[PDB]
């Protein structure tokens, strides 16, 4: 269960790695890794006493994505929405919340991921 860092962000699934800090309600910020490839993203929480080790804290698949919100006062704490979407709206099962370094690349990248597991377009 724990996992090396560098050996995941290595491998050739990841489209693309997002160092970050996981936000608690309790004012707790996690050092942690978002790995985003084509179908899920993974958080990786950093373990503090363990050097280049983490945990899978989180595996979200893309598709599920029902929400992704910030507020412009703090443009890099971002709030990912989980769970069920039909022609009657979204269900809401799990929500994250990670301050991202460079957050509007990192926003930009998932929904581009999101788009293209809807996308077969010119197969």
Same mark, same amino acid.
Request: net charge positive; proline share 4%; hydrophobic share 40%.
């Given at each position: 269960?724990?996992?090396?860092?560098?050996?995941?962000?290595? *491998?050739?699934?990841? %489209?693309?790695?997002? !160092?970050?800090?996981?936000?608690?309600?309790? @004012?707790?910020?996690?050092? /942690?890794?978002?790995?985003?490839?084509?179908?899920?993203?993974?958080?990786?929480?950093?373990?503090?006493?363990?050097?280049?080790?983490?945990?899978?804290?989180?595996?979200?698949?893309?598709?599920?994505?029902? *929400?992704?919100?910030? %507020?412009?006062?703090? !443009?890099?704490?971002?709030?990912?929405?989980? @769970?069920?979407?039909?022609? /009657?709206?979204?269900?809401?099962?799990?929500?994250?919340?990670?301050?991202?370094?460079?957050?509007?690349?990192?926003?930009?990248?998932?929904?581009?991921?999101?788009?293209?597991?809807?996308?077969?377009?010119?197969?």
């Amino acid at each position: 269960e724990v996992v090396n860092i560098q050996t995941w962000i290595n *491998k050739p699934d990841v %489209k693309h790695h997002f !160092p970050c800090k996981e936000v608690k309600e309790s @004012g707790h910020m996690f050092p /942690s890794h978002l790995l985003v490839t084509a179908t899920h993203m993974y958080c990786l929480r950093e373990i503090v006493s363990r050097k280049g080790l983490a945990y899978i804290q989180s595996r979200q698949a893309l598709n599920s994505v029902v *929400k992704i919100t910030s %507020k412009k006062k703090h !443009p890099e704490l971002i709030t990912f929405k989980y @769970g069920n979407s039909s022609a /009657s709206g979204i269900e809401i099962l799990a929500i994250e919340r990670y301050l991202i370094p460079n957050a509007g690349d990192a926003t930009k990248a998932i929904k581009q991921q999101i788009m293209k597991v809807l996308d077969a377009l010119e197969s």
